[PDB]
Design a protein around this nucleic acid. Structure first.
Ligand code: MG
Ligand code: ZN
Ligand code: ZN
Ligand code: ZN
Lengths: 196, 49, 485, 66, 263, 113, 97, 61, 194, 140, 133
RNA sequence: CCCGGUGUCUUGGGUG
């Protein structure tokens, strides 16, 4: 609940996770680099407070602008047999060897947001076209194609990939054959191909 | 909702003015084009009938 | 429709990182790999290979979707029940599934510069995300908080060659924008590589053997330990040096250090071996003249691309077994330092009182080009920003070397001096439109103050740290500055 | 919705202890002590019972469609 | 040369000290018990009627998590290895459940004790729902109100935890060693004094403290591993430790077989 | 939709060998062993055991990608011993230690029964 | 000395002022007083100062390229429709802006 | 081919005992849209039982 | 004529410092023995002192260096900045040559003085940006490489080649070939959409 | 009741404790402002509780006084996208799209305002056991 | 069979920032102006101030791919307590008397000051430092 | 007995 959002990068089965001496393994793991530049110190304090809260059996009051201090919560926690700042010794799951560093560990409220990958994944080979432009349709729900916009165009010029850019915008899209008159230059030719 | 419009960035409306204290939320506002123009009533607010 | 348009053979999904992919690879979901296709022309050298794809059909990978004759008639392999009776003729085309080593153009909007579109080699993988090696997130300005990226498949022999020989990822390591690299070692691997190359990191024999084997380019010769007796021990600098190719020389001096290097700063590399120096952002970051730039000039783009993969695989393994964390304890300065911190803020509030006294008793020096009120506002702002920096400097120096916040700031991997200052000492002055908080209310900033109050607390100085917690008045002012951003 | 069968984090069965927990609260025991009596010692197991919200009692009040 | 000293014991958890082995062997034993010791668990639910307020697969999901007596599971085959057509008496246990609420008032609570074994292997003690006592109703599955009925047929199969965590015969495995950090495998974080700020292990009194003037033994290795294996009741604690060792043997045996056959 | 079958971690395809030995001819007397459908569980056990033998000069393993249940081990021995034979010796030692270990647990268990 | 407002011709003539070095940050006025080649140098100085201010550094040839385009016609061609589309380039190219 | 769209049970393999529907029956390799997971598997014809008037008979029906 | 990816900040060796420090570093006096080249770094040390004909080259060398320093300090880089983006880095090329040929030790070099002066001067005519014999092209070709030639001459000065870098005959000919090859490779490629 | 116009003319104490002068040096806790520009203040009103300046969405955040502005705004947006039992009658409504989390839990760290909100009765999330650690590099 | 040999008195031991490395400075008991600056691992070889240390420098331990030492073979290191292997990265031909030799033992740095007649043989590619008692 | 496709214009909220 602190603007610390992420996607799952991999899953690990129970026995490969790091574990504390009590055999508790974390359910979800986040990265230490998310904290110092974002300065969501409240996220850490919530973890600390919730640890205390689950040991003694109540929901801590985390209302803003109260007399609750970090030291008061830390005092309670140490009196229950855990390190005062929330750390715990943990063991690497692959080898059983201790980690040289201790790991901040505890409950945190996490929320499941509406953006799931199988609602976004999309691919198109060939497919339906617009009646008017004979170009690929717009949108996931219509088997559409991605937009090669103006800024994409510029990048291929910078690479000097002139051949690639031609193919993308013709053979891989709405290529059409027309006949012109060599004298007047208009597309006014009437071409019956079976009568030649 | 404040119906001023997306056109015109401006350095007034979108901003959180001092007199909003206790009347509209200082935190809750959308990202993007509506940012600072759509606001939300603080918890104890009321509207005169 | 003409300067830009929608296109075939494209795909899009959420991206995830993978340290165990080469720099120029992209992991492509199986479902996407069965929908996209490439029309490979049938020749004498691949006709046997291509028939195997035809028997497997559109639903088993590696397979194929169409067979195109020279006249143009496509045979749709979903509905052809006599698929076993097709014999391929030279010159026909088979639209086979996307497969290993095929080059594809990868792209993440908005394309602001040319390294928003680079060619990667496709590696087919389970699950539904695109996988990127972690060192290419920087040129795309990509991260993995929900970003999506686009993939485009070239459709002919000519454009495959254009992609691999002009747009490929190793050719793009140095950018013409500032004649320096745009990719370096980032995040975990950069934080970890500082910790690993500290002077007192030692690794016993059993772990060393695994680390050497983790380097794909290793020549099979285990190097001699730095300590032979009473126990064989290698230093971190020796194993990192395995990942650097031979013949690389680099010298840099930080703060006039001697060759003895008491602070363990600077950098000296001789024949691809680290003599001394902690490896941090100044050496393996994206700065000009660093390690990555040097390998590029001496060895070319191919070798330099392996450098990223080698370093990453070693450090992430070592960091996995050392561990690293951060907790609430790391924001907390001890009781002695707080009194220093509190004094410097208390004395700064007194100087601001003196300035108000002088300005109201006509005893204040006028700054050139400025009215009295501008000069007054200018002097107060300078005092308060110097107060926070002074308080921040005190908090920083008290932190021990083992403190986890200090290790990330010192590595350069995330965070800076001001972040230590604001978490632990003092958030400092809040600004709106380049000025202090304005009198929105008639002659006052909030109805909890009296009128004509120009003190620090009245016009937006947040005295508390985020650790201590902000008071209600300070909170709103902080939300005003934050909104403006 | 209804009490989970297993603790998510460690796997210890907790779906047979929900009835016992509500009865202990009628007798005036405090939440921490009630969990202690049920031998739920690790705090991963404690969150499961302490923070579950029993919504199924509300859904049953809706008259059966059939 | 390996030695074991059991500190405490009861039906569903064994606390023990393991000594004169390598760290890697203690860890591989930990992993094997969690992941590869077979058990029995529901793996197919045929719903003929479900007019409760819970969704069909929601109820089915809870069923998979019910621990079943798995004592004789070693003589049972995997479904994927059986020569028969469909499912028979040698590769599955069939369970049935039927509940209903008559009356316009009150709530009928459907418990795991209503799971009735119908068919299974002959004379094998498997497929039985775990129970603490005899008057223990067990695990809550659903709740029913007037005219709501639940009538399901469940197929239980042999499996391992690698495929799905419901086949795991153990919950937590507590595990620690070297309570006074003589090996120096960790470097303690501290504000003022490391010893006062870090709590003591619950096995601190089982190993003497390091002498202040004592020299650092750079040859000492980890040598005593205290662990506690808790189980869910699907297997008794002594069986899990024994079958963990047994399973790990066949895996190494299978590797040994393949080398002497590849020549 | 793209999740692989979980049973593929331990069930061996018919055209895929459980074990594959190839030489590393760049140095004398070195083999690469590719283990299919196995984990750290097996690999770490073999690795430490092997490292305490006097005639093993190099042993290492890596799990190249956690989404694929395989690993590859590299084993080099001095000129006298053949690596593949040494691997058999490491296997039999551990089977023996676990047999002993299983026996001593059974005895201690009845006393507490 | 540094002054507010714009005036270059008259200030250059004032005795005491080093008339060979006086500079103005309005390159429009520079063009009228000193000519097109001086404008090329002044344009570069003012762009570089903007980019370099937040510590960034862009290689010389890119900013040099932009100011040569802006001065090739002999007068200052603004990067707006009123400048760009007054070129003798084809109609299809010009109408796409 | 009178085997399409009819309900099927699988009698051998890792999916033994599962219900499905014949989505596509080109030749020898069927496409069953298994009821359980949301996917259509490729499967050989030796592996299937078909439902008929009396229980799960073979392809004879 | 250069591609932006191929340049790096390098220091010019003739900008900073006093005239005295400059003279100490670059001047060779074949008359005054204590201001000549040290005898232990060359074999031919005997046939050196007094030779007025060899002194005419070294005077022309130092006169060339004086022109460059005067041109660069008064016209090109008035504020004294001497670190600038330039192509074909020389510091790295030299220290690689020191590694390939094991250029350590105290042994005297067999590399004669006329080989150095004529070698470097002939190099500066092969740094082709534009080819063709037209009179205007040669002036343009000379103008394009003016700054880079000064950079080379500031490094491959007689005292530095012999006392500091200690190149032999094999290594020095290699250094010239590498500079020549890498400068060509650093030209921008026609067709580039700059 | 006071509106914005009348608020201009009153003097508000932030908490009841500020109505009276006091008699600390706890280096962990936050510094209260000195307020030494006016010698004696004459308060006319007092806030009921200062946490009521927040709205519905921001009231779900535990400890917003310890976070950067940008993060409270971001959570106030994301909180409206989090799957929770939106009503207890979901089986009889036929909405275009609906999501119901299997096992909602009430949060271990709550605020007083969540009582009125009924967040503990219809919660929208779960308490995960979280380690903050660099593990395999698959979480950079 | 060795290149250099002497006995040193430890004047300073500065652990400083680190927990496992200390820098020591020493001067030869028999010949002043020969100074040795050396980083060493505290936990493996604890040193105190004023300790007497025999320091030998060899280019070989014999009386390329490292192997665990067999207990049957024998080398120069059997008679010493602390051995390190390193790279010579600077050979300073100082004016007059001074002759500095900088060696890097995997980032553990050793600085050896002294005279030409004592150190001329040390112009080597690699060096093994052996410390006794 | 092959081939076989269906939408256009706006509004509101998100994502980055
Ligand atoms: Mg993003
Ligand atoms: Zn015509
Ligand atoms: Zn639990
Ligand atoms: Zn069977």
């Amino acid at each position: 609940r602190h603007g610390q959002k992420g996607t799952i990068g991999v899953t690990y089965r129970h026995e490969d996770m790091p574990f504390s001496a009590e055999g508790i393994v974390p359910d979800l793991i986040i990265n230490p680099h998310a904290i110092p530049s974002r300065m969501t110190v409240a996220h850490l304090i919530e973890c600390l407070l919730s640890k205390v809260g689950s040991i003694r059996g109540y929901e801590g009051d985390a209302t803003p602008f109260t007399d609750l201090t970090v030291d008061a919560v830390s005092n309670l926690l140490r009196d229950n047999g855990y390190q005062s700042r929330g750390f715990e010794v943990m063991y690497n799951g692959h080898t059983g060897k201790k980690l040289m560093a201790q790991v901040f560990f505890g409950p945190t409220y996490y929320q499941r947001l509406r953006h799931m990958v199988d609602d976004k994944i999309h691919a198109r080979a060939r497919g339906p076209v617009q009646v008017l432009t004979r170009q690929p349709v717009e949108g996931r729900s219509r088997d559409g194609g991605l937009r090669f916009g103006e800024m994409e165009r510029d990048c291929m010029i910078a690479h000097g990939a002139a051949g690639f850019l031609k193919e993308r915008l013709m053979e891989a899209s709405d290529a059409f054959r027309v006949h012109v008159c060599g004298i007047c230059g208009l597309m006014s030719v009437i071409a019956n191909l079976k009568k030649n | 909702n404040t119906p001023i419009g997306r056109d015109g960035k401006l350095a007034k409306p979108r901003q959180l003015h001092n007199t909003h204290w206790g009347l509209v939320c200082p935190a809750e506002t959308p990202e993007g084009q509506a940012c600072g123009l759509v606001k939300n009533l603080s918890l104890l607010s009321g509207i005169s009938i | 429709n003409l300067m830009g348009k929608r296109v075939d053979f494209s795909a899009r999904t959420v991206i995830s990182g993978d340290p165990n992919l080469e720099l120029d690879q992209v992991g492509v979901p199986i479902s996407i790999a069965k929908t996209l296709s490439y029309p490979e022309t049938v020749t004498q050298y691949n006709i046997h290979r291509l028939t195997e794809y035809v028997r497997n059909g559109p639903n088993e990978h590696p397979g194929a979707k169409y067979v195109i004759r020279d006249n143009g008639d496509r045979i749709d392999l979903r509905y052809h029940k006599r698929a076993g009776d097709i014999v391929l003729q030279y010159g026909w085309k088979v639209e086979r599934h996307l497969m290993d080593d095929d080059p594809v153009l990868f792209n993440r909007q908005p394309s602001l510069h040319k390294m928003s579109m680079m060619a990667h080699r496709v590696k087919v993988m389970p699950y539904s995300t695109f996988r990127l090696n972690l060192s290419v997130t920087s040129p795309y300005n990509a991260d993995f908080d929900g970003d999506e990226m686009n993939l485009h498949v070239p459709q002919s022999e000519e454009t495959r060659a254009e992609l691999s020989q002009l747009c490929a990822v190793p050719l793009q390591i140095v950018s013409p924008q500032s004649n320096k690299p745009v990719m370096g070692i980032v995040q975990d691997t950069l934080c970890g590589v500082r910790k690993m190359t500290l002077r007192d990191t030692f690794i016993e024999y059993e772990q060393v053997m695994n680390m050497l084997f983790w380097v794909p380019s290793w020549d099979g010769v285990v190097p001699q330990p730095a300590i032979l007796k009473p126990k064989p021990l290698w230093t971190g600098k020796q194993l990192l040096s395995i990942a650097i190719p031979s013949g690389i020389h680099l010298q840099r001096t930080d703060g006039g250090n001697s060759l003895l290097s008491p602070k363990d700063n600077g950098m000296l590399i001789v024949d691809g071996k680290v003599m001394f120096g902690v490896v941090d952002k100044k050496t393996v970051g994206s700065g000009g003249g660093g390690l990555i730039h040097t390998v590029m000039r001496e060895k070319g783009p191919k070798i330099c691309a392996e450098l990223f993969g080698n370093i990453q695989k070693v450090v992430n393994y070592w960091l996995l077994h050392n561990g690293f964390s951060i907790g609430i304890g790391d924001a907390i300065a001890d009781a002695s330092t707080m009194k220093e911190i509190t004094h410097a803020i208390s004395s700064a509030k007194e100087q601001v009182q003196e300035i108000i006294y002088k300005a109201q008793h006509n005893e204040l020096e006028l700054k050139p080009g400025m009215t009295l009120r501008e000069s007054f506002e200018g002097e107060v702002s300078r005092t308060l920003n110097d107060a926070r920096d002074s308080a921040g400097r005190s908090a920083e120096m008290n932190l021990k070397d083992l403190n986890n916040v200090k290790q990330m700031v010192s590595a350069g991997s995330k965070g800076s001096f001001i972040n230590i200052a604001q978490m632990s000492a003092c958030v400092g002055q809040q600004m709106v439109e380049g000025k202090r908080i304005a009198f929105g209310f008639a002659d006052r900033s909030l109805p909890h103050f009296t009128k004509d109050d120009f003190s620090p607390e009245s016009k937006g100085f947040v005295e508390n740290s985020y650790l201590r917690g902000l008071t209600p008045q300070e909170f709103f002012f902080h939300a005003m500055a934050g909104r403006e951003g | 919705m209804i009490i989970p069968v297993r603790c998510f984090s460690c796997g210890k069965v907790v779906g047979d202890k929900w009835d016992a927990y509500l009865r202990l609260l009628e007798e005036g025991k405090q939440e921490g002590d009630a969990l202690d009596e049920l031998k739920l010692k690790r705090y991963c197991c404690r969150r499961m019972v302490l923070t579950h919200v029993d919504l199924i009692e509300k859904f049953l009040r809706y008259n059966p469609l059939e | 040369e390996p030695k074991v000293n059991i500190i405490n014991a009861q039906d569903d958890e064994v606390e023990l000290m393991l000594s004169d082995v390598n760290l890697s062997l203690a860890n591989s034993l930990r992993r094997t018990m969690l992941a590869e010791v077979p058990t029995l668990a529901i793996d197919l639910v045929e719903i003929k009627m479900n007019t409760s307020v819970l969704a069909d697969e929601f109820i089915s999901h809870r069923l998979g998590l019910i621990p079943l007596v798995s004592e004789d599971v070693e003589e049972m085959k995997y479904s994927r290895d059986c020569t028969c057509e469909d499912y028979c008496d040698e590769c599955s246990v069939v369970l049935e459940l039927s509940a209903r609420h008559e009356g316009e008032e009150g709530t009928t609570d459907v418990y795991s004790s209503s799971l009735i074994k119908v068919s299974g292997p002959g004379n094998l003690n498997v497929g039985e729902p775990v129970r603490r006592d005899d008057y223990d109703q067990g695990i809550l599955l659903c709740k029913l109100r007037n005219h709501q009925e639940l009538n399901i047929r469940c197929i239980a199969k042999k499996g391992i935890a690698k495929e799905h965590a419901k086949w795991s015969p153990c919950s937590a495995i507590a595990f620690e060693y070297d309570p006074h950090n003589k090996l120096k495998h960790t470097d303690f974080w501290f504000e003022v004094d490391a010893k006062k700020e870090w709590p003591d292990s619950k096995y601190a009194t089982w190993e003497e403290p390091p002498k202040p003037g004592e020299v650092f033994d750079y040859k000492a290795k980890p040598n005593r591993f205290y662990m506690t294996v808790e189980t869910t009741g699907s297997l008794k604690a002594n069986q899990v430790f024994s079958r963990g060792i047994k399973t790990l043997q066949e895996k190494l045996a299978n590797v040994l077989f393949e080398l002497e056959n590849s020549r | 939709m793209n999740a692989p079958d979980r049973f593929e971690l331990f069930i061996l395809p018919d055209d895929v060998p459980k074990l594959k030995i190839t030489p590393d001819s760049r140095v004398p007397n070195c083999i690469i062993i590719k283990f299919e459908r196995e984990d750290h569980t097996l690999a770490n056990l073999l690795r430490e055991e092997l490292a305490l033998y006097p005639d093993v000069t190099f042993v290492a393993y890596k799990v190249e990608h956690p989404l694929f249940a395989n690993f590859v081990m590299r084993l080099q021995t001095e000129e006298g011993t053949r690596p593949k034979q040494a691997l058999e010796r490491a296997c039999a030692s551990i089977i023996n230690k676990l047999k002993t270990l299983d026996h001593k647990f059974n005895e201690e268990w009845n006393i507490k029964n | 000395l540094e002054t507010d407002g714009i005036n270059l011709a008259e200030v250059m003539a004032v005795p005491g002022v080093d008339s060979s070095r006086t500079y103005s940050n309005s390159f429009v006025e520079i063009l009228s007083v000193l000519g097109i080649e001086a404008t090329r140098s002044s344009l570069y100085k003012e762009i570089l100062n903007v980019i370099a201010f937040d510590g960034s550094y862009v290689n010389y040839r890119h900013m040099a390229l932009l100011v040569d385009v802006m001065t090739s016609r002999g007068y200052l061609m603004a990067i707006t429709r009123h400048g760009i589309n007054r070129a003798d380039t084809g109609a299809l190219m010009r109408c796409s802006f | 081919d009178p085997t399409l769209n009819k309900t099927v049970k699988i009698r051998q393999g890792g999916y033994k005992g599962k219900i499905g529907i014949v989505k596509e029956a080109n030749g020898d390799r069927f496409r069953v849209e298994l009821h359980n997971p949301n996917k259509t598997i490729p499967i050989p014809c030796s592996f299937l039982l078909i439902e008929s008037t009396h229980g799960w008979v073979p392809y004879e029906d | 004529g250069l591609d932006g990816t191929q340049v790096e900040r390098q220091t010019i060796d003739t900008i900073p410092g006093s005239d005295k420090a400059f003279h100490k570093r670059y001047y060779v006096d074949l008359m005054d023995e204590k201001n000549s080249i040290k005898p232990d770094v060359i074999e031919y040390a005997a046939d050196i002192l007094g030779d007025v004909e060899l002194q005419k080259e070294l005077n022309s060398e130092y006169e060339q260096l004086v022109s460059d320093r005067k041109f660069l300090r008064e016209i090109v880089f008035v504020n004294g900045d001497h670190n600038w983006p330039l192509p074909v880095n020389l510091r790295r090329i030299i220290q690689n040559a020191q590694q390939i040929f094991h250029l350590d030790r105290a042994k005297a070099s067999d590399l004669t003085i006329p080989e150095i002066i004529h070698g470097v001067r002939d190099l500066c005519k092969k740094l082709f940006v534009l080819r063709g014999e037209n009179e205007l092209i040669k002036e343009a070709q000379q103008n394009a490489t003016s700054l880079f030639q000064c950079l080379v001459r500031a490094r491959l000065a007689t005292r530095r080649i012999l006392e500091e870098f200690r190149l032999n005959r094999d290594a020095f000919e290699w250094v010239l070939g590498t500079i020549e090859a890498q400068f060509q490779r650093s030209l921008v490629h026609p067709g580039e959409m700059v | 009741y006071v509106d914005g116009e009348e608020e201009e003319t009153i003097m508000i104490a932030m908490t009841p404790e500020d109505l009276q002068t006091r008699s600390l040096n706890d280096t962990a806790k936050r510094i209260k402002p000195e307020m030494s520009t006016s010698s004696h203040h004459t308060f006319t009103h007092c806030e009921i509780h200062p946490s009521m300046i927040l709205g519905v969405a921001a009231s779900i955040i535990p400890f917003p006084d310890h976070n950067q502005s940008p993060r409270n705004t971001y959570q106030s947006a994301m909180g409206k996208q989090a799957m929770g039992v939106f009503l207890t009658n979901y089986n009889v409504r036929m909405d275009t799209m609906a999501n119901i989390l299997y096992y909602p839990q009430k949060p271990l760290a709550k605020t007083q305002a969540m009582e009125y909100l009924k967040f503990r009765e219809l919660p929208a999330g779960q308490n995960a056991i979280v380690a903050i650690a660099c593990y395999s590099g698959y979480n950079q | 069979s060795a290149l250099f040999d002497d006995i040193f008195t430890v004047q300073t031991v500065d652990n400083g920032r680190y927990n496992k490395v200390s820098r020591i400075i020493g001067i030869s008991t028999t010949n002043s102006a020969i100074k040795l600056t050396l980083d060493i691992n505290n936990e493996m070889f604890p040193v105190s101030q004023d300790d007497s240390l025999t320091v030998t420098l060899a280019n070989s331990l014999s009386l390329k791919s490292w192997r665990p030492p067999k207990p049957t073979d024998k080398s120069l290191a059997d008679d010493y307590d602390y051995v390190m292997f390193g790279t010579v990265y600077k050979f300073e031909e100082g004016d007059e008397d001074k002759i500095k030799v900088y060696v890097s033992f995997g980032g553990l740095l050793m600085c050896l000051e002294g005279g030409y007649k004592s150190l001329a043989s040390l112009k080597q590619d690699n060096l093994y430092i052996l410390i006794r008692r």
